[PDB]
Amino acid sequence: KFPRVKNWELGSITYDTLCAQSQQDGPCTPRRCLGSLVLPRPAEQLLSQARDFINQYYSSIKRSGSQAHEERLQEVEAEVASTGTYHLRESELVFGAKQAWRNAPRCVGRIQWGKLQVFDARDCSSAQEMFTYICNHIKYATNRGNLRSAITVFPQRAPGRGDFRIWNSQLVRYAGYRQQDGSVRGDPANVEITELCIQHGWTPGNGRFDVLPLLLQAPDEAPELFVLPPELVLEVPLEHPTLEWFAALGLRWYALPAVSNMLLEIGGLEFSAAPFSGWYMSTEIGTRNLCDPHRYNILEDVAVCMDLDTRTTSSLWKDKAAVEINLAVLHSFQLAKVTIVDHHAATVSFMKHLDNEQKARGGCPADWAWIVPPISGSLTPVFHQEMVNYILSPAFRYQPDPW
Amino acid sequence: GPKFPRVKNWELGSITYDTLCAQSQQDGPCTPRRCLGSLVLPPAEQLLSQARDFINQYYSSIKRSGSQAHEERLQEVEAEVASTGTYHLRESELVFGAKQAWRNAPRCVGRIQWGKLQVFDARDCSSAQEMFTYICNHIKYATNRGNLRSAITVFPQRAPGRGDFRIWNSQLVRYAGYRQQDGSVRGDPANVEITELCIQHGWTPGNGRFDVLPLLLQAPDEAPELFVLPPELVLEVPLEHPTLEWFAALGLRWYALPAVSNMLLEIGGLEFSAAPFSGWYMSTEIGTRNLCDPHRYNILEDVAVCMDLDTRTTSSLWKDKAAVEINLAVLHSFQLAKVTIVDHHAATVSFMKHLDNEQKARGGCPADWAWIVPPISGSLTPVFHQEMVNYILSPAFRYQPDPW
Numbered sequence: 001k002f003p004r005v006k007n008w009e010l011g012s013i014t015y016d017t018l019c020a021q022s023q024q025d026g027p028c029t030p031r032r033c034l035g036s037l038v039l040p041r042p043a044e045q046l047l048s049q050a051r052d053f054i055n056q057y058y059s060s061i062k063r064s065g066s067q068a069h070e071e072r073l074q075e076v077e078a079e080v081a082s083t084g085t086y087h088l089r090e091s092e093l094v095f096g097a098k099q100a101w102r103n104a105p106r107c108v109g110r111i112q113w114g115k116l117q118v119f120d121a122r123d124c125s126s127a128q129e130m131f132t133y134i135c136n137h138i139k140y141a142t143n144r145g146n147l148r149s150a151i152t153v154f155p156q157r158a159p160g161r162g163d164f165r166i167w168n169s170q171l172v173r174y175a176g177y178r179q180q181d182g183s184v185r186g187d188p189a190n191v192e193i194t195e196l197c198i199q200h201g202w203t204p205g206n207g208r209f210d211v212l213p214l215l216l217q218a219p220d221e222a223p224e225l226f227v228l229p230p231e232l233v234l235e236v237p238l239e240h241p242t243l244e245w246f247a248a249l250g251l252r253w254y255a256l257p258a259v260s261n262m263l264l265e266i267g268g269l270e271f272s273a274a275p276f277s278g279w280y281m282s283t284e285i286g287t288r289n290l291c292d293p294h295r296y297n298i299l300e301d302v303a304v305c306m307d308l309d310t311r312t313t314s315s316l317w318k319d320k321a322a323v324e325i326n327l328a329v330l331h332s333f334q335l336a337k338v339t340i341v342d343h344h345a346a347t348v349s350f351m352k353h354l355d356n357e358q359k360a361r362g363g364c365p366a367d368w369a370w371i372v373p374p375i376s377g378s379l380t381p382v383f384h385q386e387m388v389n390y391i392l393s394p395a396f397r398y399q400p401d402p403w
Numbered sequence: 404g405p406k407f408p409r410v411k412n413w414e415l416g417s418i419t420y421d422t423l424c425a426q427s428q429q430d431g432p433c434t435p436r437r438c439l440g441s442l443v444l445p446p447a448e449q450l451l452s453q454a455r456d457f458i459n460q461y462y463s464s465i466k467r468s469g470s471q472a473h474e475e476r477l478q479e480v481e482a483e484v485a486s487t488g489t490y491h492l493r494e495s496e497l498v499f500g501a502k503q504a505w506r507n508a509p510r511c512v513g514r515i516q517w518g519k520l521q522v523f524d525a526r527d528c529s530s531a532q533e534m535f536t537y538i539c540n541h542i543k544y545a546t547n548r549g550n551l552r553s554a555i556t557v558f559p560q561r562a563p564g565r566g567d568f569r570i571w572n573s574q575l576v577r578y579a580g581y582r583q584q585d586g587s588v589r590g591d592p593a594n595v596e597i598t599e600l601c602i603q604h605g606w607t608p609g610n611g612r613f614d615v616l617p618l619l620l621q622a623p624d625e626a627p628e629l630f631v632l633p634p635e636l637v638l639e640v641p642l643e644h645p646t647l648e649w650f651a652a653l654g655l656r657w658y659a660l661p662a663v664s665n666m667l668l669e670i671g672g673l674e675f676s677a678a679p680f681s682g683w684y685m686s687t688e689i690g691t692r693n694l695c696d697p698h699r700y701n702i703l704e705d706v707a708v709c710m711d712l713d714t715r716t717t718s719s720l721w722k723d724k725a726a727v728e729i730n731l732a733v734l735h736s737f738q739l740a741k742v743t744i745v746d747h748h749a750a751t752v753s754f755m756k757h758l759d760n761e762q763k764a765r766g767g768c769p770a771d772w773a774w775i776v777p778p779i780s781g782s783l784t785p786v787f788h789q790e791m792v793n794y795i796l797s798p799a800f801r802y803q804p805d806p807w
C-alpha cells in the first residue's frame with residue numbers, strides 16, 4: 001500500500017501518499033535495493049506529460065476547470081498535434097522550475113523552494129548570448145555575498161538538433177592540472193574539464209585554485225571558451241578562529257554553488273542547459289571538497305599542523321582535523337559576510353520542510369544517503385528520520401557529457 | 404554489458420557487478436515506484452523448497468555438490484518432513500548456516516570475521532534454568548577476560564504446536580531505564596519497557612544510570628523466568644579521556660560484550676527463535692549512538708559544557724567536537740582496559756576488504772549503506788564512497804515480534 005514513515009527520535013509516524021503520483025521508475029525492485037547508486041544505470045507520451053503539468057499549474061493558482069485552464073490545454077493539444085512539440089508560458093516555466101527544485105530528493109535546501117529567481121533565457125541563439133546570461137545570473141545570485149537562489153533557463157531541446165549545453169559541471173570550478181608524476185595540482189574532479197578547456201585554446205595556470213573558463217555550446221556548433229571576469233567570481237580565503245597557522249595553508253573556496261550540467265524536465269519538455277544556484281552548506285566545502293581522498297585531500301596536512309598522531313586510526317586524527325576544517329569554512333564565510341549554512345541548521349530546516357510537505361502534499365521525496373551530512377550524521381535530526389525516495393515531475397535529471 | 408547491477412567505488416573509480424543478488428529468494432521493501440531502503444523495520448511444500456535450497460548450499464560449500472551423500476541427505480530431509488512436518492539439521496549443517504547467516508547480514512560491518520565464529524549447539528536445552536546456564540557459558544567464553552571472541556548459542560528450533568524458546572531482552576547485557584515521576588528517564592531510555600517487564604516479573608530494581616538488567620528467559624509454553632547475571636561475568640569498562648582529566652569524573656561506563664538476543668535465526672526454513680550472538684563493539688556504537696542519541700543517554704550537551712563550547716549556536720560545531728571526544732574516550736578506555744574494540748576507520752577499511760573477498764567468492768555482497776556507513780565522520784571512511792546492493796539471502800538473521 002502506502003509506506004509507513006517513522007521518526008525514531010520522536011516516535012512519530014507519517015504515511016507517504018504523495019509517492020502514488022510518481023510516473024517514473026527508480027533503480028530498485030523487490031529483489032534488490034540500489035538506493036545507494038549515484039547514477040541511473042510517441043506524441044501521446046508527450047501530450048500526457050504536458051496535460052499533467054498544465055493541470056498542476058492551474059491547480060497551483062487555484063483555477064482548475066476554468067476558462068483559461070481549458071483553453072491552455074487546447075493550445076498545448078493543438079501545438080503538439082501539428083508540430084510534435086509545444087512551448088511554455090513564462091509563468092508556467094517559473095512554476096515548473098520551482099516544482100523541480102521542490103521535487104529534488106537529494107536537495108537539503110528545499111525549505112527555500114518557493115523563493116527562486118527564474119531567468120527566462122529561451123531567446124538565446126549563440127554561445128556569446130549564453131555567456132551574457134550566465135554573467136548576469138552570477139552577478140544576481142552572488143549579490144555581494146548575500147546569496148540569492150537563481151536559475152537561468154536556456155532554449156529547450158528540439159528534435160533533430162543539437163542541445164544548448166554548458167560543458168562545465170559548475171559555473172565556478174577550480175582547474176585540475178595532471179602532473180606527469182601521477183599527482184594532480186588543483187581539483188582532481190576537474191582534470192577532464194580542465195583538459196578540454198586547454199585544447200579549445202585556454203592558457204592554463206599552475207595554481208591549486210585557478211578558476212576555469214566556461215565552455216558554452218550553441219547547437220551543432222563547437223563549444224566556445226569564455227573567461228569569467230574575476231570581479232564576478234567572489235571567493236573566500238580560509239582561516240581558523242583560533243589556529244593562526246591555518247590561513248598559511250593558502251586555502252580558499254568560491255561563494256557561488258551553481259550546477260550547470262543537469263537537465264530540467266517540465267511537462268515533457270527538456271531543458272539541457274538550465275544552471276541553478278543557491279548557497280553552500282558548509283560540509284560540501286569543508287568535508288567533501290577539501291577532505292575527500294579523491295579531491296584536495298587535505299586531512300593529513302591539517303592533522304600534522306595540529307600535531308596529531310597520524311600513525312594510528314584510533315587517535316581519531318581524521319575526525320579531529322575534519323571538524324576544524326569545517327569550522328574554518330563557517331568562520332571564514334561568516335567573516336566575509338557570504339551566505340552559508342552549517343549541516344545542523346540545514347537539516348533542522350529540512351525537517352521543518354518535511355513537515356510542511358506532509359501537510360501540503362501528503363509526503364516528500366527524499367534521498368536519505370544524500371540528505372544526511374558527510375560528518376556527524378546521527379548528530380543531526382535527519383539521520384533518525386525514515387524517508388521515501390521517488391521521482392516526481394518537474395524534475396532535475398542527470399544527462400551525458402556532451403563530448 | 405552485464406545484466407546484473409553495476410556497482411561503483413567513487414574514490415577509486417573501480418566497477419564491479421553483483422551476480423550474487425540473483426540467488427535472493429526473498430523480496431525486500433523497494434519497488435520501481437519508490438525506494439524504502441532507509442526504513443529500519445520494513446506448508447510442507449514451502450519448507451521442502453527452502454530445505455532443499457539449504458542442503459544444496461551446504462553440499463556446495465563442502466564441494467560435494469551432486470554427490471551421493473548430497474542426494475541422500477536430500478531424500479533424508481524430504482522423507483523426514485514427510486512424516487513429521489519438520490526436519491532437523493546435522494551439527495555441521497548448523498555451523499555452516501549459522502556462519503552463512505552472519506555472512507549474509509547486510510547491516511553488519513564486522514563480516515570480515517565471518518569464518519571465525521564459535522557455534523554453541525544448545526538444541527538439547529529443555530528448561531529456562533538450562534538456558535541461563537548456556538547463556539552464562541556464552542558470556543564467559545565470548546568475553547574471555549577482555550580478549551573478545553565471536554560466538555552464537557543456538558537453542559531449540561520452533562516446533563509445530565509447541566511454544567518458542569525466547570529471550571525477552573534485546574541484548575544479553577542492557578542497562579535499566581527507570582521512568583521518573585517528572586517524566587524523564589533514569590538510565591537507558593531504549594530499555595524502559597523491558598525494565599518495567601522485569602519488575603512486573605518480580606525483579607527488585609536499582610536506581611542507577613547503569614544497572615544491568617536480569618534476563619527474562621522463556622521455555623516452551625511456560626511463563627518467562629527471571630535470572631540475574633553474576634556481576635563478575637559482566638565485564639564493564641569505565642570511561643576516561645586521555646587528555647581531558649574531568650571526563651573520568653562524569654562516571655560514564657559501558658559493557659564489553661555486544662550480544663544480540665532477540666533475533667530469529669532462519670536456516671533452510673527452520674526457525675531458531677532464541678539464538679543469541681555476540682561480537683565486539685565498533686566504537687561509534689557506544690560513543691555516538693548509545694551515548695549521544697537524543698533518545699538514548701544524550702550526554703552531548705553535558706560534555707560540550709565541560710569542554711566550554713558555545714552550545715547556543717549550531718555553527719560552533721559544538722556537537723561535532725564533543726562527539727569526537729566522546730568517541731575518543733570510548734576507544735582510549737577500552738584500549739586501556741585491554742577489552743577488544745574497533746574504531747570506525749579500522750572497521751570500514753576491513754569491511755572494504757570483505758567486499759573484495761566476497762566479490763571473488765560469491766560475486767557480490769549484500770550491504771545496507773545507511774547502516775554500514777558510521778554515524779560520525781561518514782565520508783572520512785572508505786565505505787561512504789562505495790556503492791552497495793542490498794537484498795535478502797538465506798540463511799538469515801531476522802527481526803521477530805516481541806514475545807509479549
Ligand code: HEM
Nearest residue numbers: 101104106107108109112149150276277278279280281396
Ligand atoms: C538555497 C540553498 C541550497 C542549499 C543549502 C542546497 C543544498 C544542497 C546539497 C547539500 C545538495 C547535495 C549535493 C552534493 O552534495 O553533491 C544539493 C543537491 C541538489 N540541489 Fe540544492 N541546495 C540549495 C538550493 C538549490 C536550488 C536553488 C536548486 C534548484 C533550483 C537546488 C536543486 C538541487 C538538486 C537538483 C540537487 C541534486 C544534485 C545531484 O543529484 O547531484 N538546490 N543541494
Ligand code: HEM
Nearest residue numbers: 505508510511512513516553555680681682683684685800
Ligand atoms: C565480530 C565483530 C562484529 C562487529 C564489529 C559487528 C558490527 C556490527 C555493527 C556496527 C552493526 C550495526 C548495528 C547497529 O548499529 O545497531 C551490526 C549489525 C549486525 N550484526 Fe554485527 N558485528 C560483529 C559480529 C557479529 C556476529 C558474530 C554476528 C552473528 C553471528 C553479527 C550479526 C549481525 C546482524 C544480524 C546485524 C544487523 C542487526 C540489526 O539489523 O538490528 N555480527 N554489526
Ligand SMILES: Fc1cccc(C[C@@H]2C[C@H]2NCCc2ccnc(-n3ccnc3)n2)c1
Nearest residue numbers: 038039107109170257258259276277278279
Ligand atoms: F561524476 C559525477 C557523476 C555523478 C554525480 C557527481 C557528483 C554530483 C555532481 C554533484 N551534485 C551537485 C554538486 C553541487 C555543487 C555545487 N552546487 C550544488 N548545489 C547548488 C544548489 N544545490 C546543490 N551542488 C559526479
Ligand SMILES: Fc1cccc(C[C@@H]2C[C@H]2NCCc2ccnc(-n3ccnc3)n2)c1
Nearest residue numbers: 443444511513574661662663680681682683
Ligand atoms: F527499537 C528498535 C527496533 C528495531 C531496530 C532497533 C535497533 C536495532 C537493534 C539494533 N541492532 C542491534 C544492535 C546491536 C547491539 C549490540 N550488539 C550488536 N551486535 C553484536 C554483533 N553485531 C552487532 N548489535 C531498535
Ligand SMILES: C[C@H](O)[C@H](O)[C@H]1CNc2nc(N)[nH]c(=O)c2N1
Nearest residue numbers: 036037038369370787788789790
Ligand atoms: C556511494 C554513495 O551513495 C555516494 O558516495 C553518495 C553518498 N551520499 C552523498 N551525499 C551527498 N550530499 N553528496 C554525495 O555526493 C553523496 N554521495
Ligand SMILES: C[C@H](O)[C@H](O)[C@H]1CNc2nc(N)[nH]c(=O)c2N1
Nearest residue numbers: 383384385386441442443773774
Ligand atoms: C531512519 C534511519 O534508517 C535509521 O536512523 C537508521 C540509519 N542508519 C543506522 N545505522 C546503524 N548502524 N544503526 C542504526 O540503528 C541505524 N539507524
Ligand SMILES: [Zn+2]
Nearest residue numbers: 028033438440
Ligand atoms: Zn531501494
